[PDB]
Design a binder for this molecule. Sequence first.
Ligand SMILES: [Mg+2]
Ligand SMILES: [Mg+2]
Ligand SMILES: [Mg+2]
Ligand SMILES: [Mg+2]
Lengths: 231, 211, 233, 240, 222, 235, 244, 195, 4, 4, 204
Amino acid sequence: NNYDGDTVTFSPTGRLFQVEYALEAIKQGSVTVGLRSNTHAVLVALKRNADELSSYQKKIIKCDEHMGLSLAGLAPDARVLSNYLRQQCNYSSLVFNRKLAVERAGHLLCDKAQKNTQSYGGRPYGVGLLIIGYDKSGAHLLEFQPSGNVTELYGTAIGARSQGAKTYLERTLDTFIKIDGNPDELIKAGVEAISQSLRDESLTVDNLSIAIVGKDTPFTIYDGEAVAKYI
Amino acid sequence: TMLAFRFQGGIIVAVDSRATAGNWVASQTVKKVIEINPFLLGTMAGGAADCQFWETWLGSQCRLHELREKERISVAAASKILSNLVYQYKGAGLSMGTMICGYTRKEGPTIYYVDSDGTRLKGDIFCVGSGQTFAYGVLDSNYKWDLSVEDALYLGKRSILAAAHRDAYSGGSVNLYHVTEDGWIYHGNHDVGELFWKVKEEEGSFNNVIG
Amino acid sequence: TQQPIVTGTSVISMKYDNGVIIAADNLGSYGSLLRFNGVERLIPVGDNTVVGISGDISDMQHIERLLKDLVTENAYDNPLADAEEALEPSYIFEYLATVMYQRRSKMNPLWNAIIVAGVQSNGDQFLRYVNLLGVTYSSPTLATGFGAHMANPLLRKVVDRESDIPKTTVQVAEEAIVNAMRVLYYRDARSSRNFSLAIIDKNTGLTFKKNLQVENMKWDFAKDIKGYGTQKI
Amino acid sequence: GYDRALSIFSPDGHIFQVEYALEAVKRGTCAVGVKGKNCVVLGCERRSTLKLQDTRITPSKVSKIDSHVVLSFSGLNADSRILIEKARVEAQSHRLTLEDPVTVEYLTRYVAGVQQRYTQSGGVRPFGVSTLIAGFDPRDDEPKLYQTEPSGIYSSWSAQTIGRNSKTVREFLEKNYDRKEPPATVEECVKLTVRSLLEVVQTGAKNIEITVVKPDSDIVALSSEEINQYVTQIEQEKQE
Amino acid sequence: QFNPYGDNGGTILGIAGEDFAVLAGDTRNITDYSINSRYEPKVFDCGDNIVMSANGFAADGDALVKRFKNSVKWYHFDHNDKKLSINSAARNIQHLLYGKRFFPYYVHTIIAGLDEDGKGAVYSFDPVGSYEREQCRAGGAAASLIMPFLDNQVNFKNQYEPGTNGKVKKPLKYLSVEEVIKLVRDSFTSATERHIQVGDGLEILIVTKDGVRKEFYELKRD
Amino acid sequence: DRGVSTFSPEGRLFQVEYSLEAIKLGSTAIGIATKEGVVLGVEKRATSPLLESDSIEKIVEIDRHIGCAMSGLTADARSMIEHARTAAVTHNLYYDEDINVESLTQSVCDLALRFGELMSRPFGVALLIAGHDADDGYQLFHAEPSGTFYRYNAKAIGSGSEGAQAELLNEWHSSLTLKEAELLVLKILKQVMEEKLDENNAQLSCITKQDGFKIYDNEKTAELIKELKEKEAAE
Amino acid sequence: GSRRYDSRTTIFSPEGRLYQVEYALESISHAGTAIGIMASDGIVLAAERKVTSTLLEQDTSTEKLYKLNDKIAVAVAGLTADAEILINTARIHAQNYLKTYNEDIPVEILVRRLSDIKQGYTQHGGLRPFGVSFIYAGYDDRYGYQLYTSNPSGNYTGWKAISVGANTSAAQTLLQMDYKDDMKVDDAIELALKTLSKTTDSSALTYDRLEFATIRKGANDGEVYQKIFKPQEIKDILVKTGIT
Amino acid sequence: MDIILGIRVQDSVILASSKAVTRGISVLKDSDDKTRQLSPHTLMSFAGEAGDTVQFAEYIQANIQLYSIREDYELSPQAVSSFVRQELAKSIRSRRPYQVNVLIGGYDKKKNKPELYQIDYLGTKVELPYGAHGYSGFYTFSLLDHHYRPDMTTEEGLDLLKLCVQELEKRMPMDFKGVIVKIVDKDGIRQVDDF
Amino acid sequence: XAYX
Amino acid sequence: XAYX
Amino acid sequence: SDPSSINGGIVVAMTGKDCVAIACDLRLGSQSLGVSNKFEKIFHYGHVFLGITGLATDVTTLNEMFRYKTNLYKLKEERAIEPETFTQLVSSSLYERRFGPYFVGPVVAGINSKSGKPFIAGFDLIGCIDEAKDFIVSGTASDQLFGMCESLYEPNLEPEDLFETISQALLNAADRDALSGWGAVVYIIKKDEVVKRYLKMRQD
Ligand SMILES: [Mg+2]
Ligand SMILES: [Mg+2]
Ligand SMILES: [Mg+2]
Ligand SMILES: [Mg+2]
């Protein structure tokens, strides 16, 4: 009310409204799902179009051969944070000849988002990210919120009507976690998960965006006729 | 060895194709002419990289000019971008001997000599390189304004052959160019290996050499 | 622009079937003066890597601090700091190799020759060299200073190429190193008798041996040598 | 450094600071530009509430940017000096690198670019100035007349006016100026310019300034008596 | 005074065929009169069917290759996984090298691959970024030994058609991959005999449309 | 007052949303993408008849293979075009090739959100970026001051946008010829424009692989206007 | 943050006026009147001291009239402290020009630069403008005797006769009435004093409440002399014109 | 670069400047104009380090032309010379100084007098009846000491200048390919085409 | 580096 | 400088 | 390439009875080549006189610099600067350029308007003040001037006598220096009159 003018101001109840308004931009964003087994980690993203004449906003960005995220909210902010991750992944490779741990990737994003919530003039990031990766400790899935809070999960979903997919994954937890050495079956579980967040619209060929990383699989994105298999 | 002269029928530009690393012959197939645009040519003498890099960059600056001003850059303005650039690097050890040759409506056929110590000269005839003196010798003694396009092309080619022969640091092949009101025309690559014996026989020159 | 003051001499190393051996004497020379005799020039990083350093000792002590600080930094927010995300020899090397080349590129080098000996997580032997110029190379045998001239020839008689590594035992490899250290004591005027030796085995792990001495030395034949030519008495 | 974003969008999609800068221009003394067949004329109003002025030393309303280009303006006088100075420097900088004086379009584009920069730079307010830039490109006999405004938009005009009661004199020029046949001579072009100012000014004494620009750096300012002759001639034809 | 440069010796060789290209280099790394490594590769697969070698000062060579490999990676990120054409890679490297004009990379750089017409391509650079496409280029310590041999056997220089009174030249023609590797192996064995900094091993990287293949051959270790 | 980079309760940046209102006030610009080329057309909208309409430059060349049309506070576009031209030429210098239309658009859109308390406010102008490259062929992009860009088969921006966009929805198919597209831009411009459409108050342009980016003459557009009127009267 | 407390000194009103400039001019309108009159053979500077106290040291005092160089002087109206900042800048600018060109600075060039500084404070920096209006009285070999005025807006204009500070409306009418072009210095001295004597808010105009200065060519042959009047000299000139 | 002369006579200033531009063992050009017009009644000849000369001359020219437009007034030759001297005086303590020597010939329209200023690259200014830079002085100064009179006409000045060029052509080691002569007077700057 |  |  | 001996020149200052004298040659050369015989090396700021020898570009620069500073001094102080004060200003200004100095040998001369005391002072290029009762010398013939002044000088000379002593000190010193001479100027300074005399000397 009187305490939402900037990010440097606390409310009387100890809230940061500018951070909460940034969090609101994610809820408006299109749904995206993340889930993993012990061998593979999968991103499934529902892409959004302006109209029938427009393209479908690309939701998934590659960060390294072994890591990448899906976005929900302000796309330019996702481009800034994904670019920062690419550099940090790249720094780890050139200097230490070491693939950046997915956990450290989270820690670095958290600390970058935090500095924007404590300083005058700046603003919080207006985007949520789902980071998947395969490193020395197996498959990983992270959920980044622009409050700075990063969380490691078996599965999750963010965006509009994400609660539908998040409930499904909470039920399916025991099933999909043990889909080891089977990419197509883990994707199917991810496609069935995002289907619980659909209303009036269904998954078409230029609408669905899938990404996968795993043991003997570099981070690769599937769009267009390549995702026709999973409809 | 490179020359560029103005005459009745526009501009002749001729260069050799030899690269030297001391007394080591690095290359005989070097391109020492850069085609900046259909009406602008650049000759590269000095540091192989210095000339190549900054004249390619000059071409980018000439392209940005015609985008911004909706008009092909003047030979004077193009030459002065390069001369003002190298002058900023004066004392840093850049090595650049360059002739900027081209035609525009307002200027007509124009040649600008630009070197790394900041000198910028308009002129009708320029010879630059280790063999500049050998090329000047033949070119000056046979030059007239009223040369035909055929005769002018030959004199440019023959002036390079002369330097390619005497100067140890000149040779390989001759690359010929003609610049008219309509723009520049490439007049082929001429290997000195064959060109020398062809000229000797047909012209009756080069009597110093064992035939 | 530097000049080295207190210096360490040869560091020698080689691969064997299961791991790597590295050794370096305990001397800190001050030009011709053999000034410091208790200097350790082998610095273990974790339980799977040893960094042998020659050249300026002030710069060596700086690198000690960087490696010590690297272990601390790696442990931060790292539950697998003593497991999957422990420091690898390859990581420690590339870090130093990056630093060494950056310092040479700023015309303010770390006046050192470094050999990183260790065993990777997958059991593969790691042995690689880097110096003040940022120059890097790997070989079955690596040595710095005099070691390059006198040790490498002896160690290459044991392991001449890659195919010889599975055929070389730790007993044979250690014998060759200890023999090389003796030869360096005979012939290097900035060497000491006292040295340290480290074995990184993929089975038995890191064995760090301190206060070793060169022994079984041949001096007896000296008694028979007179003047420089014609002198009979 | 002072960072404050002074020029910002409002809910209705307006940048008020830019629009309020236009109000300053509307307050400023009237300035008119009329281009003929072989010339451009810049007419300028001078308010007559100031007597005991020294017209020798008082800053003239029309400024030479180069020997071939002139700039008149409406709005804040102090602001105009900063644009004129920058334009004059860019004029000499262009001659130094391109070895050719600026085109009127280029000089306008530069001044308009400066005005625009002050509408999305922190710590600065927009220029409370609109300019008429007139002249002849090097080795060209085609007359050029451009207008700029605080927002940074610029455009070419057959004839244009700016400042107070500019809408009245623009109304006059819109019916009196024929595109198919512009003022053939200097006299015809000056007369139409004086006529347009006489709709607004008050008296044709020391209230009207006229500057005539012709091809190849031929710029001259008319004196009181020379302008007064046009005023005398127009009034006698009017009584009909 | 500190000297930031050193000479790691070795020699490299790039030949271009009709539908292929080879980039060969010896595996010997040296300082002064000492051998550092008998097998230290300096010819690398950089992705997008580009093979690269920066011979001279290994520290500068490794730094450049590392930076170009990184350049290829960011080209994919910034331009929708577009394949970096050999001509584009060459121009990119010119800017890397010239970026240190006043503190150069002490390396003769060669890259090889296929042009956009599928035909074999070799580009060669000087330390400060001057580059040129050629059928043939040797670089490094034994360049002066190998290069005139290539001029004679690849480009058929000074070779005239028998009985034509030295009037008709030997016609230029593309060589088979088998014929090129013969010339490479004979080039390096000859260089090994007469240059002390050349020997130990020969590693050849062959580039066809099918990808990058390797071949290794022993050289004399003296 | 309030911060420039502030979020609304609904989760939008106030200044970005207000800049979009400025773009709605702007003159109409239409772009149509075909397999034979991309057509760009704009409403000039001269504020007075004395203003020489040919000096109204709302269609602009970025490179030989990329053109650009603008709508809104057109003064703000100058620095965006300057950046786009530098980006295009700089990429050609570094990589000896044409730059992808998408990569150019992305480079321009990176400026968009570089405002706050960098420049003082977002851009008050939307751009239609049309071009061709070897990879993705003929492309049309809509670049907003939000930093977001959509690829379009066809797109209208400015005052008559929502009306023109609904018209483009019905008329566009994947088999349109260049000539068909030219007439379609003229047709839809004439429908949404206040004053009557002619060669002086409307401008056409196109980008083809063969001839690159070309702004049409007033003589050429006039014949397409006459061809359009005859075809509508013919049924 | 600090945005809360920013007055925004360099913004436009809806009417297209600069708030702080307008309010600075309002400040100056209360300051002691200063008059400049330019004659054919010299310039007069007259200024009324702000309500004097009897225990103020009059002879060793400077409030209104300041020397910029040997050929240029200024009459101040507004904050003295603000004026002294600008005067020291003007004095330096004059010496920079002399050092560069080995010629005394033309009056207009000095006026323009000082006016350009004031302009800057209205367009950028977020600082308050200088609450000062100057009357510049100077001579150069181009335009001869020149009178200028500058105000907080940074706008300057040339004058034959001009007033700044209090009662300028009334003062300008009286000058406009009695001024003519062929006027001498001694006549201009009388006009300047007569104008102040009628526009003054004081009961009667006395020597102790005035600062006076002339710039004549009244030196020996083709050279200019600046005369900052002493108290006793103002007392004599006030009796000579018959005001006391 | 090399030979630049100046002679101030009764009613004008005459500047003679060599036409040769030599680099190495080659005369690249024999028609070079080593002068810039700073203002309608002020001309500056220059000689020194290659590149520096023209870069400096054009920089001064730009600054004087900017002043002329701003004030709608021509700076006096004395004022221009003082400005040029200060620029060179700054230059000499720079990281890389301008190695340029100049003569400034001007006609002061207020004084109705010709004025010749000699300024070296250190910023050493002198007003002279006749001036020269480089080795030229070592011949011309002693010759002008003899033959120069202060009340000479422009024609007498040109004959006096011909005497200097003849002496330089006879005793100077290098071929400087003759001179371009320019006259500065009340009517401005004009070039003598036949010398 | 090389260097006509 | 001068220089006890 | 010794900055102090490229252009050449000399300055000498003396004290008399209720008077001071300062004199300089007129030569400006480029080593061997004489260029100007009108280059005066003595300037004045009110009643304070300053002679400067050394590199001519710095002589001109410092004159312009001290004119600048004494003009601002007078405007703020509302009085002419005195010799003692000016001496301190010269010292400050020179030492400000300690590690990039003006290659000059300045000499202050004048009478304090309050006390009426004759005052002279000399400086090294780095600003060290050399105050003296009798005389100060500077330039390429400083050795010669020292030898002349030390022998010819006597205290409490009348202005007319002091003129002869300083004139003979300069002339005979200048004729034993290659880079000095080519004309000479002498300033005789009394409390409220200053006479400037050009000397006839040999022109070689
Ligand atoms: Mg050479
Ligand atoms: Mg050997
Ligand atoms: Mg003498
Ligand atoms: Mg002599």
